[PDB]
Amino acid sequence: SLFELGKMILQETGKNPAKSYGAYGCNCGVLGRGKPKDATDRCCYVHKCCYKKLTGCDPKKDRYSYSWKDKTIVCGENNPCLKELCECDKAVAICLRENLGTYNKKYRYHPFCKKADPC
Amino acid sequence: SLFELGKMILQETGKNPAKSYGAYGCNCGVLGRGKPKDATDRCCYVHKCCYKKLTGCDPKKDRYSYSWKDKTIVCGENNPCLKELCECDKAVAICLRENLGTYNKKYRYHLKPFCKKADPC
Numbered sequence A: 001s002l003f004e005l006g007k008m009i010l011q012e013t014g015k016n017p018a019k020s021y022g023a024y025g026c027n028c029g030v031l032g033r034g035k036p037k038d039a040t041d042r043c044c045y046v047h048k049c050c051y052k053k054l055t056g057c058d059p060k061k062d063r064y065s066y067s068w069k070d071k072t073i074v075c076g077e078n079n080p081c082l083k084e085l086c087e088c089d090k091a092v093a094i095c096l097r098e099n100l101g102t103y104n105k106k107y108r109y110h111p112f113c114k115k116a117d118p119c
Numbered sequence B: 001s002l003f004e005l006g007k008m009i010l011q012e013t014g015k016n017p018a019k020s021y022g023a024y025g026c027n028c029g030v031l032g033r034g035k036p037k038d039a040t041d042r043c044c045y046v047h048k049c050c051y052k053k054l055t056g057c058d059p060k061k062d063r064y065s066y067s068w069k070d071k072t073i074v075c076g077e078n079n080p081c082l083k084e085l086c087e088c089d090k091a092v093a094i095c096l097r098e099n100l101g102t103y104n105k106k107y108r109y110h111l112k113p114f115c116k117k118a119d120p121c
């Protein structure tokens, strides 16, 4: 769910997930994927691409189990798509932390971006 | 792909990428991950971990056109999935060069299985 995803971005970056990434660029947030503005936006771009190949569960409501070992996000086996769902959030949570130096506030708030290419 | 990534390794390290990093340690290779045997192995370990973040990026489309300008890899592909794939290949090529001093040919080909299980990325 958004609880797990938010906890991941918070545990990775230490930042407010809804404040920093609730409406960042043209991929972080709602309304699908658009032409990314930076690397942080590219993370949410791949994140929603990671959601398209998800079948058997809704990424926004279905709660899953993960742990925090050795300062790493460790997904619980749970169910195949739920595991793939957990990996999508973990991937972008790691991705946003690794591009946190490229973060610019001018993109913190977003149909003005070009149509997204196929994943 | 392997062609672009191989080209990057040779341009940074000056070594035949298949000979030196085709089956080195537990993570250098086109197969899988394991416990890093040394620094050069972590380059490949991080490389594989970099790959796992790309799930959803069309596995068939791995060809891209990076640039070798002023002796630096430059990923300029518009496709973000190709952009991040290029950066995954770029990062390991740099890492493989930085850890050339600690390169051990003993790990180059692993005859007996000696790989522990890979810790989570």
Ligand SMILES: C/C=C1/C[N@@+]2(C)[C@H]3C[C@@H]1[C@@](CO)(C(=O)OC)[C@@H]2Cc1c3n(C)c2c(OC)cccc12
Residues within 6 Å of the ligand: B001, B002, B005, B029, B030, B031, B032, B051, B052, B054, B055, B056, B057, B058, B059, B060, B061, B062, B081, B085
């Ligand atoms: C982007 C397209 C790709 C197509 N392919 C076959 C490439 C890169 C990525 C990847 C990585 O997971 C993928 O499916 O990402 C969505 C897969 C799996 C993969 C690739 N290499 C070059 C790999 C590699 O070389 C050292 C070693 C192990 C796995 C892969």
